Amino acid sequence: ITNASILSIVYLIDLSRYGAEIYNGDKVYYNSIDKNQIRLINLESSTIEVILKKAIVYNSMYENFSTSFWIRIPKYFNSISLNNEYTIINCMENNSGWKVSLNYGEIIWTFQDTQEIKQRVVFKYSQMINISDYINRWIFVTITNNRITKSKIYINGRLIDQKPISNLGNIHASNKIMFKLDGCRDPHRYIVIKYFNLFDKELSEKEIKDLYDNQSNSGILKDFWGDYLQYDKSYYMLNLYDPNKYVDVNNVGIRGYMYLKGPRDNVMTTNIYLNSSLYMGTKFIIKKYASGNKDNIVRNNDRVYINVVVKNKEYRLATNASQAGVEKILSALEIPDVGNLSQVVVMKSKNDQGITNKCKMNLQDNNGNDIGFIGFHQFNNIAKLVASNWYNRQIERSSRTLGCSWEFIPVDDGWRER
Smallest distance, Ni ion to C-beta of residue 155, A: 35
Smallest distance, Ni ion to C-beta of residue 82, A: 45
Between 264 and 377, whose beta carbon lies closer to Ni ion? Answer: 377
CB 281 within 8 A of CB 406: no
361 to 287, 372, 388: CA distances (angstroms): 13, 8, 11
Give ∠ CA 158-160-163 in degrees, rounded to 5. Answer: 130
Site for Ni ion (CB under 5 A): which residue of 246, 377, 385, 410? 377
The secondary structure of 143-195 as a DSSP string is EEE-TTSEEEEEETTEEEEEEE-TT---EE--SEEEEEEES---TT-EEEEEE
Smallest distance, Ni ion to C-beta of residue 390, A: 6
Between 102 and 371, whose beta carbon lies closer to Ni ion? Answer: 371
Between 316 and 377, whose beta carbon lies closer to Ni ion? Answer: 377
Binding mask 328-367 for Ni ion (x = CB under 5 A): ----------------------------------------
The secondary structure of 312-365 as a DSSP string is TEEEEEEB-TTSSSSSEE-EEE-GGG-TTSB--EEE-SB-TT--B-SB-EEEE-
Distance, CA of 195 to CA of 8 (rounded, Å): 7
Residue nearest to Ni ion (CB): 377
Smallest distance, Ni ion to C-beta of residue 392, A: 13
Q: What is the DSSP letter of 265?
A: P
Smallest distance, Ni ion to C-beta of residue 310, A: 24
CB 146 within 8 A of CB 19: no
75: three-class secondary structure by DSSP: coil
Smallest distance, Ni ion to C-beta of residue 386, A: 7
Between 225 and 390, whose beta carbon lies closer to Ni ion? Answer: 390
The CB density around residue 33, as the number of other CB atoms within 10 Å, is 12
Q: What is the DSSP letter of 205?
A: H
Choose one: 75-83, 263-271, 290-298, 376-384; the region binding Ni ion (CB under 5 A): 376-384
Between 189 and 377, whose beta carbon lies closer to Ni ion? Answer: 377
Smallest distance, Ni ion to C-beta of residue 152, A: 43
Between 151 and 362, whose beta carbon lies closer to Ni ion? Answer: 362
Choose one: 22-30, 66-74, 153-161, 377-385; the region binding Ni ion (CB under 5 A): 377-385
Residues making contact with Ni ion (CB under 5 A): 377
